[PDB]
């Protein structure tokens, strides 16, 4: 089962660096969002039905740095830098929430039941759900839980992000064929890396590939949450980079 060629190892170092350079620290230094913030001590109705404005405002406080790390990750890929600006824009819009969600999910902590967003803010499922994500909180927690057994490393996470980045079916793309070829290149190196890694579970490759489909739906589902957030939250709490990536 082939292992990475030399050129593939080089692509691997490029993507791995791009990712670790934009993925600050994570255990220790992590502060918990105060337990009062977006959680009733005793839950009496299904959660996530209206946006808790206080929780929401704490999340939007760290969302600018969060989005910029995704943007800096992409800009360190020599393949992304060959695309024209309009395709760059559309691909960042398409994959932003998919990569953010992946990252948060790999920071799942089984003992506290928390995700640590940005490597700095630990949140529970209720707090993330109530502060705007609704059911997307479940999808990210659940994905986080199911990913522990995959034992992902930096390279594997980086590679998934580049697969997600290079999706040629975002609406509006001009360089559809070039983007798919880059995706295929990333995917071929990825599979070869997985062949080298030898995780001890059957059909690991297709099992891991499936997570790309899940992260796609999470992104689609969040696009609906953004709309509900737009109607329920006052405008002043939406940072301009938040609006720029998730609008339109």
Ligand X SMILES: Cc1cc(-n2ncc(=O)[nH]c2=O)cc(C)c1Oc1ccc(O)c(C(C)C)c1
d(CA 97, CA 105): 12
Does the CA dihedral 163-168-173-178 come out positive or negative? Answer: positive
Does the CA dihedral 78-81-87-92 come out positive or negative? Answer: positive
Q: How many CB atoms lie within 10 A of CB 69?
A: 20
Binding flag, residue 108, ligand X (CB under 6 A): no
Q: Using CB under 6 A, which of the segments 33-41, 86-94, 128-136, 208-216 binds ligand X?
A: 128-136
Distance of CA 10 to the CA centre of its chain: 24
Q: Using CB under 8 A, which of the segments 3-11, 61-69, 101-109, 118-126 binds its own copies?
A: 3-11
| Window 191-210: contact mask with its own copies (x via CB under 8 A) | -----x---------x---x
Binding flag, residue 104, ligand X (CB under 6 A): yes
Binding flag, residue 90, ligand X (CB under 6 A): no
Binding flag, residue 149, its own copies (CB under 8 A): no
Q: Using CB under 8 A, which of the segments 54-62, 79-87, 150-158, 231-239 binds its own copies?
A: 150-158
Distance of CA 110 to the CA centre of its chain: 19
Binding flag, residue 193, ligand X (CB under 6 A): no
86, 153, 232, 247: residue in contact with its own copies (rule CB under 8 A): 153
Binding flag, residue 66, ligand X (CB under 6 A): yes
3-state secondary structure of 152: coil
Q: Using the minimum distance from each CB to ligand X, give the nearer residue, 97 or 173.
A: 97
Confirm or deny that 69 is annotated as ligand binding.
yes
11, 12, 33, 70: residue in contact with its own copies (rule CB under 8 A): 12
Distance of CA 244 to the CA centre of its chain: 17
Starting at the earlier edge strand, list the strands of the sheet with 121-123: 31-32, 121-123, 114-117, 108-109
- Reported in sequence order, the residue ranges of the chain that DSSP labels E, i.e. its strands, are 31-32, 108-109, 114-117, 121-123
Please identify which residue in the block is written with the tokens 């720029």: 244
Footprint of its own copies (CB under 8 A): 3-4, 6, 9, 12-13, 16-17, 20-21, 27-28, 134-135, 139, 151, 153-155, 169, 171, 177, 180-181, 184, 196, 206, 210, 213-214, 216-217, 220-221, 223-224, 227
Binding region: 69, 118, 222
């Amino acid at each position: 089962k082939p292992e990475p060629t030399d050129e593939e190892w080089e692509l691997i170092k490029t993507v791995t660096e791009a990712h670790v350079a934009t993925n600050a620290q994570w255990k220790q230094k992590r502060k918990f969002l105060p337990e009062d913030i977006g959680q009733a001590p005793i839950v009496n109705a299904p959660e996530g039905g209206k946006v808790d404005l206080e929780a929401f405002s704490h999340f939007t406080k760290i969302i600018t740095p969060a989005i910029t790390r995704v943007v800096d990750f992409a800009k360190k890929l020599p393949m992304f830098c060959e695309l024209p600006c309009e395709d760059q824009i559309i691909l960042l819009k398409g994959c932003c929430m998919e990569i953010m969600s992946l990252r948060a999910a790999v920071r799942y902590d089984p003992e506290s039941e928390t995700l640590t967003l940005n490597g700095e803010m630990a949140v529970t499922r209720g707090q993330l759900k109530n502060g705007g994500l609704g059911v997307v909180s479940d999808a990210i927690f659940d994905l986080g839980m199911s990913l522990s057994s995959f034992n992902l490393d930096d390279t594997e996470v980086a590679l998934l992000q580049a697969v997600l980045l290079m999706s040629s079916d975002r609406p509006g793309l001009a360089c559809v064929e070039r983007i798919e070829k880059y995706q295929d290149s990333f995917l071929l190196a990825f599979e070869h890396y997985i062949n080298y890694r030898k995780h001890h579970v059957t059909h690991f490759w297709p099992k891991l590939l499936m997570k790309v489909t899940d992260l796609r739906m999470i992104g689609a589902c969040h696009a609906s949450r953004f709309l509900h957030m737009k109607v329920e939250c006052p405008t002043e709490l939406f940072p301009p980079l938040f609006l720029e990536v998730f609008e339109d």
